[PDB]
Each structure stands twice: as structure tokens, then as C-alpha cells.
């Protein structure tokens, strides 16, 4: 479960990566 500065985006089929709007970065990692 993400602490949202991060947003839940899936890549087209399966996978979710946590992406932050303020820093503008896509990470596979959960802080």
C-alpha cells in the first residue's frame, strides 16, 4: 500500500510501479 505522493500506475498488462508526481519519477520500489 502506497503513501501517496506516489500513485499507482500499472504498465500495460500486469505490473504496478509507484510513481511520484513531485519528483517525477517511476520506481519499482516501495519505500
Amino acid at each position: 500500500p502506497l503513501p501517496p505522493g506516489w500513485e499507482k500506475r500499472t504498465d500495460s498488462n500486469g505490473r504496478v510501479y509507484f510513481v511520484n508526481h513531485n519528483t517525477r519519477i517511476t520506481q519499482w520500489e516501495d519505500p
Binding site: 504498465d11 510501479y17 510513481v19 517525477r24 519519477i25 517511476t26 519499482w28
Partner: peptide
């Protein structure tokens, strides 16, 4: 070894 997707909606 995977790339990240770029931040662009």
C-alpha cells in the same frame, strides 16, 4: 535488468 518507463502521462 529491466528499464523503468519514463514519466510522461
Amino acid at each position: 535488468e529491466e528499464p523503468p518507463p519514463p514519466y510522461e502521462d
